[PDB]
Write a protein that binds this DNA or RNA. Structure first.
Ligand SMILES: [Zn+2]
Length: 252
DNA sequence: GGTAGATCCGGACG
DNA sequence: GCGTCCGGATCTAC
């Protein structure tokens, strides 16, 4: 799930788990658990805690419990579901949080690629994976000035910069390509080559693109198809180690 | 210390 | 058809 979908999960999951008390934690693929390093300690520490809140930072979900925060990343295919402990588990279920009311929060992921970290709540923001995370794209903390400051001091491409989690939180490959198209900026442009005008326009389109999605694609996955603006075939390359989609006429 | 490379995974695919 | 690819983000090494 991309940031907008992660926000939907945050909003929808919260009422389904708030006020429930963890009775057991069952782990079927311990490598998902990144902190504490021992998955047995991860399970043990969560028992007896009640779910109090659910927040989002970039694409991370932060489950707030009594003493601890659980920080979860679903990557591309991870999913959460609340269901009865009496029913058979779905395939690829790697972690289950069992509540005292006979319901469960289940984590599933065909790719087995997601991560979970648990720390005392007051520690979570200063440890991985939240430590160093950049500002929310929809917050005033993410501004043209902030983007310009990062752009001038790097030799990297503009796409590489937007994909950097320390620059802006959880802006995915899809939104990077869509925002660059909407801004009329080539993904391989050096970040430092962008004018003040271009930085402003890029910030504007990043906010509009992600904001529209939180509340329909021009280029992403559309290689070989006509640009919706000018009819030129969309092209695909590799930029910053990612599949990269752009209109060679409209982007400069 | 900025930045590239390695790493984790398995469905899709040559 | 069995090796290659690929996404995010963090860790490791230049
Ligand atoms: Zn075009």
């Amino acid at each position: 799930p991309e940031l907008p979908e992660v926000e939907t999960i945050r909003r929808t999951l919260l009422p389904l788990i708030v006020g429930k008390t963890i009775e057991d934690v069952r782990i079927f693929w311990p490598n998902i658990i990144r902190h504490p390093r021992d998955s047995e300690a991860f399970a043990a520490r969560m028992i007896g805690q009640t779910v109090r809140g659910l927040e989002r930072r970039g694409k991370f979900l932060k489950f707030l419990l009594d003493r601890d925060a659980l920080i979860s990343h679903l990557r591309m295919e991870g999913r959460y579901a609340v269901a009865s402990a009496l029913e058979p588990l779905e395939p690829h279920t790697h972690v289950v949080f069992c509540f005292t009311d006979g319901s469960e929060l289940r984590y599933r992921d065909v790719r087995k690629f997601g991560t979970m970290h648990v720390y005392a709540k007051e520690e979570a923001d200063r440890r991985p994976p939240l430590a160093e995370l950049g500002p929310e794209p929809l917050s005033p903390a993410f501004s043209p000035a902030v983007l310009a400051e990062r752009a001038v001091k790097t030799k990297r491409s503009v796409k590489a910069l937007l994909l950097d989690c320390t620059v802006v939180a959880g802006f995915g490959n899809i939104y990077v390509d869509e925002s660059l198209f909407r801004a009329g900026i080539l993904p391989g442009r050096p970040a430092a080559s962008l004018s003040s005008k271009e930085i402003e326009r890029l910030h504007e389109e990043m906010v509009a693109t992600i904001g529209e999605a939180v509340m329909h694609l021009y280029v992403y996955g559309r290689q070989g198809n006509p640009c919706k603006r000018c009819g030129t075939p969309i092209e695909k390359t590799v930029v910053a180690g990612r599949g990269t989609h752009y209109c060679p006429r409209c982007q400069r």
